[PDB]
């Protein structure tokens, strides 16, 4: 559900034949050296490795230290650049990464506006604000990407873009 | 596999008439004497002797204790200095010849993908990546050949191969 999977991370591309204990020791050391722990001790409680598919799950003692550890994405461990991700069944709460899109040409419809946005990735929410009487577009919209990592990319990619005789505004909605 | 040979050592210059049990007793005793063991018990599980060519293979219970026993090069057994080496198929970088196979038609099952691969020789490791929910192939796999020398010829043969709808990508998984 909404609050599940908040103290685990997926780690891909792990070193061949690495032990769970060695991985645990590596991450606990890095958490401490990097200043990512929030209290004395080791944030990583356990590592479960799938050897056949070469990935691991890390289990953390707290929700906030799990979040901090996302910063280790790409860290080199015994020659391998580790891939660090959220569990697939972890999700931010609804609207956490809502985008406002303003300055759209009023004659474009829903599908036409989404075409610009979905070029960065799939959307879990979208609405183009329209005058409810006439049904006409007011030239601004909101959306949310399925993958919340995409949010900063769409902003970097679309904000301030020239579009007709307007500059697009794309920013986090709150 | 890439570790099966990480637990063996070559022993050369063995005295005439030596038995496998006497060889095993000698190395276990040497291991314990040098304090090179990382657990109670005997690190050497078995020895196989070729009396005709005066060499033997030692099989160890662990990768680290095998590495420790490299220090025994030159050791005196029945008056003779023993030659100790890695097996020729030893892999200093484990997993260096693991392959990634991408662009597989997504209806192909395990056996079918393997049949594509084994025309170059036998595999010691294989896995086709599937969605755990549906059981459906994600369209890529990993393998490793029994004989690593086959690897590049497999890449030469399979990389870029047209496979119905798709084109294969075969490369070291790195």
Swiss-Prot record, chains A, B:
Any idea what this protein is called?
Splicing factor U2AF 65 kDa subunit
RRM domain location, by residue? 7-89, 97-174
Lineage here is: Eukaryota, Metazoa, Chordata, Craniata, Vertebrata
Q: Which sequence positions carry the modification called Phosphoserine?
A: 132
Molecular function (Gene Ontology), one example: C2H2 zinc finger domain binding
Q: Which UniProt keywords apply?
A: Acetylation, Disease variant, Hydroxylation, Intellectual disability, Isopeptide bond, mRNA processing, mRNA splicing, Nucleus, Phosphoprotein, Repeat, Repressor, RNA-binding, Spliceosome, Ubl conjugation
Summarize the subunit comment.
Answer: Interacts with U2AF1L4. Heterodimer with U2AF1. Binds unphosphorylated SF1. Interacts with SCAF11 and SNW1. Interacts with ZRSR2/U2AF1-RS2. Interacts with RBM17. Interacts with PRPF19; the interaction is direct. Interacts with POLR2A (via the C-terminal domain); recruits PRPF19 and the Prp19 complex to the pre-mRNA. Interacts with KHDC4 (Isoform 2). Interacts with ZRSR2. Interacts with the SF3B complex composed of SF3B1, SF3B2, SF3B3, SF3B4, SF3B5, SF3B6 and PHF5A.
Instruction: Name the associated disease, please.
Output: Developmental delay, dysmorphic facies, and brain anomalies: An autosomal dominant disorder characterized by global developmental delay with intellectual disability and speech delay, epilepsy, hypotonia, short stature, microcephaly, intermittent exotropia, and non-specific facial dysmorphism. Brain imaging shows a thin corpus callosum and/or delayed myelination.
Quote the annotated effect of residue 7 to W.
In DEVDFB; likely pathogenic
State its location(s).
Nucleus
Q: Which GO terms describe its biological process?
A: mRNA processing; mRNA splicing, via spliceosome; negative regulation of mRNA splicing, via spliceosome; negative regulation of protein ubiquitination; positive regulation of RNA splicing; spliceosomal complex assembly
Q: Which family does it belong to?
A: Belongs to the splicing factor SR family.
* One of the record's GO cellular component terms: spliceosomal complex
Q: Which residues carry this modification: 5-hydroxylysine?
A: 114
Q: Which organism does this record belong to? A: Homo sapiens
Protein function: Plays a role in pre-mRNA splicing and 3'-end processing. By recruiting PRPF19 and the PRP19C/Prp19 complex/NTC/Nineteen complex to the RNA polymerase II C-terminal domain (CTD), and thereby pre-mRNA, may couple transcription to splicing. Induces cardiac troponin-T (TNNT2) pre-mRNA exon inclusion in muscle. Regulates the TNNT2 exon 5 inclusion through competition with MBNL1. Binds preferentially to a single-stranded structure within the polypyrimidine tract of TNNT2 intron 4 during spliceosome assembly.
């Amino acid at each position: 559900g909404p609050l599940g999977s908040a103290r685990r991370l997926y780690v891909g591309n792990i070193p061949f034949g690495i032990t769970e204990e060695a991985m645990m020791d590596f991450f606990n050391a890095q958490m401490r050296l990097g200043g990512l722990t929030q209290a004395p001790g080791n944030p990583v409680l356990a590592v479960q490795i799938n050897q056949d598919k070469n990935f691991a799950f890390l289990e953390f003692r707290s929700v906030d230290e799990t979040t901090q550890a996302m910063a280790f994405d790409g860290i080199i461990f015994q020659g391998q650049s580790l891939k660090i991700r959220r569990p697939h069944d972890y999700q931010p709460l609804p609207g956490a990464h809502k985008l406002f899109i303003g300055g759209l040409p009023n004659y474009l419809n829903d599908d036409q506006v989404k075409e610009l946005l979905t070029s960065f990735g799939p959307l879990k929410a979208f609405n183009l604000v329209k005058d409810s009487a006439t049904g006409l577009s007011k030239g601004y919209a909101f959306c949310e990407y399925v993958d919340i990592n995409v949010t900063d990319q769409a902003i970097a990619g679309l904000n301030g873009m020239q579009l007709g005789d307007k500059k697009l505004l794309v920013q986090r909605a709150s």
